[PDB]
Design an enzyme around this catalytic site. Structure first.
Site, PDB file in Angstrom:
ATOM      1  N   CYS A  20       2.084  -1.879  -0.812  1.00 19.14           N
ATOM      2  CA  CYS A  20       1.677  -3.166  -0.182  1.00 19.14           C
ATOM      3  C   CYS A  20       0.615  -2.947   0.890  1.00 19.14           C
ATOM      4  CB  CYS A  20       2.881  -3.999   0.281  1.00 19.14           C
ATOM      5  SG  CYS A  20       4.023  -3.132   1.357  1.00 19.14           S
ATOM      6  N   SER A  21       0.984  -2.794   2.182  1.00 22.99           N
ATOM      7  CA  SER A  21      -0.045  -2.763   3.187  1.00 22.99           C
ATOM      8  C   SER A  21       0.479  -2.207   4.486  1.00 22.99           C
ATOM      9  CB  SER A  21      -0.589  -4.165   3.411  1.00 22.99           C
ATOM     10  OG  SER A  21       0.460  -5.078   3.830  1.00 22.99           O
ATOM     11  N   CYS A  22       1.688  -1.787   4.517  1.00 24.73           N
ATOM     12  CA  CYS A  22       2.380  -1.427   5.776  1.00 24.73           C
ATOM     13  C   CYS A  22       1.520  -0.500   6.614  1.00 24.73           C
ATOM     14  CB  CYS A  22       3.718  -0.795   5.396  1.00 24.73           C
ATOM     15  SG  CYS A  22       4.557  -1.764   4.149  1.00 24.73           S
ATOM     16  N   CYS A  60      -0.165   2.520   2.514  1.00 24.68           N
ATOM     17  CA  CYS A  60       1.014   1.872   2.006  1.00 24.68           C
ATOM     18  C   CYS A  60       0.719   1.596   0.523  1.00 24.68           C
ATOM     19  CB  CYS A  60       1.283   0.562   2.746  1.00 24.68           C
ATOM     20  SG  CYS A  60       2.785  -0.246   2.045  1.00 24.68           S
TER      21      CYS A  60
HETATM   22 FE   LIG Z   1       2.807  -2.316   2.958  1.00 27.51          FE
END
Ligand SMILES: [Fe+3]
Ligand SMILES: [Mg+2]
Ligand SMILES: [Mg+2]
Lengths: 197, 212
Positions: free
Chosen positions: A104-106, A101
């Site tokens: 972000c971090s998905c 991601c």
């Molecule tokens: Fe993310």
């Protein structure tokens, strides 16, 4: 110039946010503790490992997982927050898939677990989309030069898992035995499943 | 928003801090770390005060140097706190009083967002599409590396979701759209300066147009 802003310790800030909300009756009893438990105990890469092992040993399920990942995952009851629309991506003798991601971090939480610190790092977020071969190499995974690397950037609601190739030397293993070698990093795509000697 | 959070393709970072299968330790490395996500969900599901999209955007709205020096989970503490202040649920006073010191928040938004586009196209697997050459100051789920670039559709989702550029600002006009897995050749994105094969970006219909 360019200095950090003054901040109270992060633990104090985080608990202040909890207390401000909780003291207004906005946080149900046991709420954050329940989420903690879900995040620690239920969301887990053992689930994605179970899915991989099933696909490896059951051609029909493999096909289902690769065509309607959400339906496949639902059969096991593993849909959940940040894991509602699932796509599984198949490694092949000429293709290695990797997930990130960049924004972000998905991550497919229910089946991969919450992301590890490194996955959320600026280093991984900046670099794997542009130089995945070198990133994987530095991490300990050499991708032969005859393999296309494909990076999936998790920019919307699709939540991905990698279906790695099944290694030689596992023929006839049980689903439990296979699951043991499908690690979190295999599901993210940065590692290939390893068979001991 | 062309913020520092849009990291993909940025050069100069060092090694990813991991070797494969190394021990990553517990899920939470400190006793507060489950709070940001838990309280996000309180806000979304229990209070109905904001969307997950608004959480993503409020983190994007951290002052850029603040973003760059803040650990992951702390960014979401900051972001959730900010939304609770902006929505009139909490005050910054009370947060700082309870914290016993400073609790700087994300910066105000500089855009009201934009609606789901009224004119879009339903694309099919194998189609060639271009990412619309548009600049959105508010939230958008399009990393800049793919803006104006051409790829091919590998998947159209069977579900639809609110347009991020609208719900990320709490607007009433986010509609719904499917998203598309768009496969770009690495050279389309980074020219000769890449060691990759292809990159698949999961792009809302409203970010796309037919290729020439
Ligand atoms: Fe993310
Ligand atoms: Mg076999
Ligand atoms: Mg940029």
């Amino acid at each position: 110039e360019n200095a950090a802003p003054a901040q109270a310790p992060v633990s104090d800030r985080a608990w202040a946010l909890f207390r401000a909300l909780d003291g207004k009756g906005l946080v149900p009893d046991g709420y954050v503790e329940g989420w903690k438990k879900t995040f620690e105990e239920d969301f887990s890469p053992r689930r994605g490992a179970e899915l991989v092992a099933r696909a490896w040993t059951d051609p029909e399920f493999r096909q289902l997982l690769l065509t309607d990942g959400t339906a496949a995952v639902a059969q096991y009851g593993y849909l959940g927050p940040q894991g509602e629309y699932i796509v599984a991506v198949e490694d092949t003798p000429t293709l290695k898939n990797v997930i990130v991601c960049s924004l972000c971090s998905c991550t497919a939480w229910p089946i991969l677990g919450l992301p590890p610190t490194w996955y959320k790092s600026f280093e991984y977020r900046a670099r794997v989309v542009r130089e995945p071969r070198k990133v994987l190499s530095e991490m300990g995974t050499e991708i032969a030069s005859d393999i296309e690397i494909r990076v999936y950037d998790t920019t919307a609601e699709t939540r991905y898992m990698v279906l790695p190739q099944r290694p030689a030397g596992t023929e006839g293993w049980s689903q439990e035995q296979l699951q043991e070698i499908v690690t979190k990093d295999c599901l993210i795509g940065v590692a290939i499943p390893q068979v001991p000697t | 928003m062309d913020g520092v959070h849009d990291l993909a393709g940025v050069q100069g970072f060092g090694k990813v801090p991991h070797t494969v299968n190394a021990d990553i330790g517990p899920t939470f490395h400190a006793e507060w770390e489950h709070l940001p996500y838990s309280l996000m969900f309180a806000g979304v599901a229990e209070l109905g005060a904001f969307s997950v999209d608004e959480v993503k955007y409020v983190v994007e709205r951290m002052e850029p140097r603040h973003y760059m020096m803040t650990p992951y989970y702390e960014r979401y503490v900051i972001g959730v706190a900010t939304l609770m202040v902006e929505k009139g649920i909490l005050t910054q006073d009370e947060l700082e009083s309870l914290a016993g010191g400073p609790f700087p928040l994300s910066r105000p938004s500089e855009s009201e967002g934009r609606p789901a586009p009224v004119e879009t196209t339903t694309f099919e697997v194998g189609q060639r599409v271009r990412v619309r050459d548009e600049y959105v100051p508010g939230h958008i789920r399009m990393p800049a590396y793919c803006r104006g670039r051409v790829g091919t559709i590998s998947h159209r989702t069977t579900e639809k979701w609110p347009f991020p550029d609208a719900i990320g600002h709490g607007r009433n006009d986010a509609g719904e759209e499917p998203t598309y897995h768009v496969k770009f050749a690495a050279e389309e994105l980074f020219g000769s300066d890449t060691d990759g094969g292809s990159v698949v970006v999961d792009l809302f219909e409203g970010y796309l147009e037919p290729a020439a």
